[PDB]
Design an enzyme around this catalytic site. Structure first.
Site, PDB file in Angstrom:
ATOM      1  N   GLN A  63       0.854  -1.190   0.000  1.00  0.00           N
ATOM      2  CA  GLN A  63       0.000   0.000   0.000  1.00  0.00           C
ATOM      3  C   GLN A  63       0.884   1.233   0.000  1.00  0.00           C
ATOM      4  O   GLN A  63       0.755   2.106  -0.859  1.00  0.00           O
ATOM      5  CB  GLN A  63      -0.947   0.052   1.195  1.00  0.00           C
ATOM      6  N   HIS A  80       1.980   3.687  -3.219  1.00  0.00           N
ATOM      7  CA  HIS A  80       1.339   4.972  -2.963  1.00  0.00           C
ATOM      8  C   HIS A  80       2.172   6.211  -3.087  1.00  0.00           C
ATOM      9  O   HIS A  80       1.781   7.307  -2.658  1.00  0.00           O
ATOM     10  CB  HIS A  80       0.537   4.956  -1.660  1.00  0.00           C
ATOM     11  N   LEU A 114      -4.878  -2.262 -12.245  1.00  0.00           N
ATOM     12  CA  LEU A 114      -4.630  -3.645 -11.843  1.00  0.00           C
ATOM     13  C   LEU A 114      -4.037  -3.759 -10.449  1.00  0.00           C
ATOM     14  O   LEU A 114      -3.970  -4.840  -9.882  1.00  0.00           O
ATOM     15  CB  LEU A 114      -3.741  -4.366 -12.852  1.00  0.00           C
ATOM     16  N   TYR A 115      -3.619  -2.645  -9.883  1.00  0.00           N
ATOM     17  CA  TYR A 115      -3.048  -2.692  -8.568  1.00  0.00           C
ATOM     18  C   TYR A 115      -4.045  -2.378  -7.501  1.00  0.00           C
ATOM     19  O   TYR A 115      -3.662  -2.079  -6.356  1.00  0.00           O
ATOM     20  CB  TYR A 115      -1.885  -1.745  -8.442  1.00  0.00           C
ATOM     21  N   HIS A 124      -7.554  -4.495  -3.133  1.00  0.00           N
ATOM     22  CA  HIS A 124      -8.330  -4.345  -1.891  1.00  0.00           C
ATOM     23  C   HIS A 124      -8.616  -5.679  -1.149  1.00  0.00           C
ATOM     24  O   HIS A 124      -8.709  -5.687   0.093  1.00  0.00           O
ATOM     25  CB  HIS A 124      -9.537  -3.459  -2.147  1.00  0.00           C
ATOM     26  N   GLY A 169       1.165  -6.740 -15.180  1.00  0.00           N
ATOM     27  CA  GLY A 169       1.922  -6.043 -14.162  1.00  0.00           C
ATOM     28  C   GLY A 169       3.434  -6.189 -14.179  1.00  0.00           C
ATOM     29  O   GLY A 169       4.118  -5.212 -13.954  1.00  0.00           O
ATOM     30  N   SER A 195       6.100  -3.361 -13.816  1.00  0.00           N
ATOM     31  CA  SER A 195       6.873  -3.257 -12.585  1.00  0.00           C
ATOM     32  C   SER A 195       8.394  -3.207 -12.692  1.00  0.00           C
ATOM     33  O   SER A 195       9.065  -2.495 -11.913  1.00  0.00           O
ATOM     34  CB  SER A 195       6.467  -4.375 -11.594  1.00  0.00           C
TER      35      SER A 195
END
Ligand code: HEM
Ligand code: HEM
Ligand SMILES: *[C@@H]1O[C@H](CO)[C@@H](O)[C@H](O)[C@H]1NC(C)=O
Ligand SMILES: *[C@@H]1O[C@H](CO)[C@@H](O)[C@H](O)[C@H]1NC(C)=O
Ligand SMILES: *[C@@H]1O[C@H](CO)[C@@H](O)[C@H](O)[C@H]1NC(C)=O
Ligand SMILES: *[C@@H]1O[C@H](CO)[C@@H](O)[C@H](O)[C@H]1NC(C)=O
Ligand SMILES: *[C@@H]1O[C@H](CO)[C@@H](O)[C@H](O)[C@H]1NC(C)=O
Ligand SMILES: *[C@@H]1O[C@H](CO)[C@@H](O)[C@H](O)[C@H]1NC(C)=O
EC number: 1.14.99.1
Lengths: 552, 552
Positions: A172, A176, A353-354, A357, A495, A499
């Site tokens: 997260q 973020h 896609l990230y 949750h 991803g 990434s």
């Protein structure tokens, strides 16, 4: 109405309208020719045959643990492997950047405007007949509906990979710094102009901010000692603006450097671990350099910390999340003899896609109590009342939810996934099949193929009708987890390219930066070179608590 | 006081202080080891031996006109040659970027802050003993003095290469999109955050400005018809801020897109030629695409125009300025199979060495009259009174001054060269010898060696004393012109690396961008592929006036 509406140009070719009804394909450098960049170039055939399916590789990668062990011990071999994964992964992403929210064509405006999120696939013409192009209905399945039928969590399903709380929160905090939508502008707009691992979340988005956060002494970040422990400084004192509910008594309005990190003690935990890690490298550099000054100490630390972050994100976080047997390695050199652009621009798709949750459980259990979202959200006291040791301990042991698979979205963060569905809608996104084709994946022939099961599959088929009209966000969650893993192929294939670019394509990874001096010596160089999630906590948390991204 | 002050680290290694009095060298990847990155690696020796001197190559390049002619006719060969020059040139510049005005060390602040000009060599420590490090005196030669003794022009010396007025002004206009100091911030700060060939000077620095300049109709830029000719629109109408002396009657306050271009009819001439060239491509695209809309027509034109600009700057401007016999070619593909960063950051050094004021004569002779600076400066009427045809004709024939060599700086633009001397001073620049070593050049053993003559040489020696204390800007002008050429080796070796980066390392040059579609078709693609300074004027100037960057 635009002839390109139907996405005619196959094989990564480019469609251009050529007179209202007719269109044209730029099959340039695709390896395919003909009207739709459909027929392969002979040599293309050769490669196409040898192309092992991602899943095959996946199998081969995830198995042979002993064969794999030999590899992990023959340096020349491992690095050799690390390289392959490193390169292949990258031929897939666009650098320099191309499209976006507003530009389905290349344009300088697109290329230059750093406020936008780049786009891996052009949006759909606002004058097309159907929202996915030409296939589908004047509308798409009702969001609220899709949300409830295949997304929302009934009974918490845990992750078969072991991803604990230390992990979910790390991801997260980590993402973020680069995922920071400028809502005032709209989705598709990032407020993190850094477009990558710049540790902006620790330091502040702007020099003005960073300065309100710094102590300007030994390069140390400002901080405070509560009880006997170190914590971020007060918004009151530093004056940095942070996002906090009016009921918060101030006095606990922690500063940190990323306005939103004050709404979940899981962020602030890490945000205090890294604050702590800053000063640490400072005192190390300051020892080694009795002759350095504040600003240099500072500037060098921010570099090492980025070095650590990339170290940990590739060798722990991604390593785990992969379930590989082969040990991934962070060694900037594997690319030193390869064509590789050291630049990066975050794509909205990556942002989308990230939206993991599902990692969230239903109570946050910090050794002794279980708290609801309603008790965790915007509540520092918890962290201050529990300490970081008995916070790291508690999270190390607390499995998190499977992301892919099905119905595992917390009814709290339901408002969110709904939105996620709605936004990608407004950002005029494309078919999940299109994106599959884009990342060299074979498109799902049935909703049933996508799910692997049949209740949801047929339940989806109810609304989407054609698989070639099924969206990206939903199907990412409503998808068939590969073996006992957390994600399905689609999420792993879109991803990984995204990434390793923003990770590898970083200035400190470039030859001119990759050397002892950049980091303050051979000392600070190894600080990067020996970073681990166990050491981050060891050195910064009260009693070297054991940790990992796995609930043992 | 900093041990690194004396620039100990030879061979491109990096000096790092290690305790007040001691320092340390990062000989990483230099190809040299030992305390000062002095002793070569064996293989380094091999290369060092074969290394032909720039001048040798220069000779070989500038001669054999017939041998060269065979080459210019064997495609496979030419391209082959074009590649070599293309690559070698580049291993010299730092990408991604490193130092600057404030950062002698790598820092994220440096790397991230786009307002700074990058630096090819770190500045000098503010705590060193002498301004050039440790060599020299508490001060440097008086600027005003150096300015007068070896710089200022007595009698106008023409360029032995033929550079006319079309050229001198082209270079002003061209470099003036990327060189745009933010004086309010200080030298070292650019206001052109684009850091490259972005044709910002035609379009406006910001989207808000570009919008005040656009007609929003067929993609065309706003304009006006004076007499029977097209001219930039009024500041009054478009409302775009431009820099104009209060005595200007408005009504002639042309808009254009680069605030300063209103102070020399040589800028505005070209600024009107390109404005005219925009609409032209629009009308071409709009023909080909009956179905395109304003914003697309616009966005595609700005791309083709950049394509043209890079085409012309390599095959005409640079080609001429080189005096090569071998035809330089602009073919983005020569790099397609090479390691090459498609990014760029303008360096103050490039900004400095480009202060080619000597090109300026003493009167501007627009077919029939001769004007003084005092009559040319901020005077549109001239352009409006003479027309562009009889402005292109007059400039095509009017040699410009030699730049290198000696005393050829117009006493008008004297205020300037003084400043240039004083600024590089404040920007704490380094020894000319240092820069020479940096670009793999052998340092000048005597002021006498630098000049090639002896009056100035001894005249310089009078003030600088040590050649290892002679500055960069002066010596660039006060230097020995290679044969019948305009510049000396130093200026040609520091600039060429700097020039081909910002030229080749441009997104439209990157594989994803380099194809028909990007430009609106196969038509707009050839517009770029056939660009020429002759065609720019042919298509946009009243009667296809013959032109060139050479006074015939
Ligand atoms: C701890 C409780 C959490 C809450 C209450 C929460 C809440 C939210 C909210 C309100 C948004 C905004 C969505 C929108 O309007 O589009 C969001 C975005 C996001 N969340 Fe979470 N989240 C939490 C945990 C996590 C975790 C553990 C991850 C880790 C992967 C995560 C990843 C994301 C991402 C990638 C975005 C998009 C960020 C952006 O573009 O601004 N969230 N979340
Ligand atoms: C046509 C008459 C010209 C005039 C009157 C003129 C005048 C000036 C002035 C006033 C400055 C500001 C210097 C300072 O305060 O530091 C300057 C800067 C400069 N000039 Fe010229 N110039 C002219 C032509 C040229 C030409 C032909 C070139 C072509 C190389 C040139 C290149 C430069 C450069 C590189 C700068 C620095 C730009 C910046 O950093 O803002 N100038 N010139
Ligand atoms: C290309 O796709 C169109 C549909 O968009 C189809 O009608 C046409 O026959 C295709 N041609 C080829 C060669 O694939
Ligand atoms: C980016 O583009 C949009 C419009 O195209 C504009 O409103 C926004 O302000 C731009 N951002 C910058 C920094 O120019
Ligand atoms: C926040 O945590 C504190 C201490 O752990 C507790 O007193 C308070 O009730 C919590 N807030 C909520 C909304 O549960
Ligand atoms: C390196 O430079 C120092 C002076 O700073 C000098 O004393 C030393 O001998 C030099 N060594 C070499 C190998 O150049
Ligand atoms: C660039 O950096 C300097 C300090 O490093 C700062 O003062 C200046 O304001 C910065 N500019 C921007 C646009 O951040
Ligand atoms: C401007 O040019 C016109 C015509 O070329 C001339 O008559 C006038 O004197 C010039 N203005 C100045 C201030 O030199």
């Amino acid at each position: 109405a635009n002839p390109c509406c139907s996405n005619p140009c196959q094989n990564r070719g480019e469609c251009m309208s050529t007179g209202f009804d007719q269109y044209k394909c730029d099959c340039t450098r695709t390896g395919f020719y003909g009207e739709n960049c459909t027929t392969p170039e002979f040599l293309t055939r050769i490669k196409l045959l040898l192309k092992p399916t991602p899943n095959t590789v996946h199998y081969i990668l995830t198995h042979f643990k002993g064969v794999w062990n030999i590899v992990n011990n023959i340096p020349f071999l491992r690095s050799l492997i690390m390289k392959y994964v490193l390169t292949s992964r990258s031929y897939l992403i666009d650098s320099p950047p191309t499209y976006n929210v507003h530009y389905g064509y290349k344009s300088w405006e697109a290329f230059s405007n750093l406020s936008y999120y780049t786009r891996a696939l052009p949006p759909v013409a606002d004058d097309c007949p159907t929202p996915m192009g030409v296939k589908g209905n004047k509308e798409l399945p009702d969001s609220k509906e899709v949300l409830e039928k295949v997304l929302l969590r009934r009974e918490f399903i845990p992750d078969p990979q072991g991803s604990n709380m230390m992990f979910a929160f790390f991801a997260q905090h980590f993402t973020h710094q680069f995922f920071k939508t400028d809502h005032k502008r709209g989705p598709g707009f990032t407020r993190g102009l850094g477009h990558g691992v710049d540790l902006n979340h620790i330091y502040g988005e702007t020099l003005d901010r960073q300065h309100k956060l710094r102590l300007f002494k030994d390069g140390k970040l400002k901080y405070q000692v509560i009880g006997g422990e170190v914590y971020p400084p007060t918004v009151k004192d530093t004056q940095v603006e942070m996002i906090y509910p009016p009921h918060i008594p101030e006095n606990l309005q922690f500063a940190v450097g990323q306005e939103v990190f004050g709404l979940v003690p899981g962020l602030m935990m890490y945000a205090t671990i890294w604050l702590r890690e800053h000063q640490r490298v400072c005192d190390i550099l300051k020892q080694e350099h009795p002759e350095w000054g504040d600003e240099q100490l500072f500037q060098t630390s921010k570099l090492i910390l980025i070095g650590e972050t990339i170290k940990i994100v590739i060798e722990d976080y991604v390593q785990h999340l992969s379930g590989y047997h082969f040990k991934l390695k962070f060694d900037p050199e594997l690319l030193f003899n390869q064509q590789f652009q050291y630049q990066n621009r975050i794509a909205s798709e990556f942002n989308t896609l990230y939206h993991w949750h599902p990692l969230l459980p239903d109570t946050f259990n910090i050794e002794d109590q279980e708290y609801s979202f309603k008790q965790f959200l915007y509540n520092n006291s918890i962290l201050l009342e529990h300490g970081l040791t008995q916070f790291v301990e508690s999270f190390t042991r607390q499995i998190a939810g499977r992301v892919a698979g099905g119905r595992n979205v917390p009814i709290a963060v339901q408002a969110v996934a709904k939105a996620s569905i709605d936004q990608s809608r407004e950002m005029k996104y494309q078919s999940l099949n299109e994106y599959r084709k884009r990342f060299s994946l074979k498109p799902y022939t049935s909703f049933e193929e996508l799910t692997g099961e049949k209740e949801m599959a047929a339940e989806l088929k109810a609304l989407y009708s054609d698989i070639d009209v099924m969206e990206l966000y939903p199907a990412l969650l409503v998808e068939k987890p590969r073996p006992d893993a957390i994600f399905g192929e689609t999420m792993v294939e879109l991803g990984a390219p995204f990434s390793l670019k923003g990770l590898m394509g970083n200035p400190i990874c470039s030859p001119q930066y990759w050397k002892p001096s950049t980091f303050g010596g051979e000392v600070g160089f190894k600080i990067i070179n020996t970073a681990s999630i166990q050491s981050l906590i060891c050195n910064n948390v009260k009693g070297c608590p054991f940790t990992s991204f796995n609930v043992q």
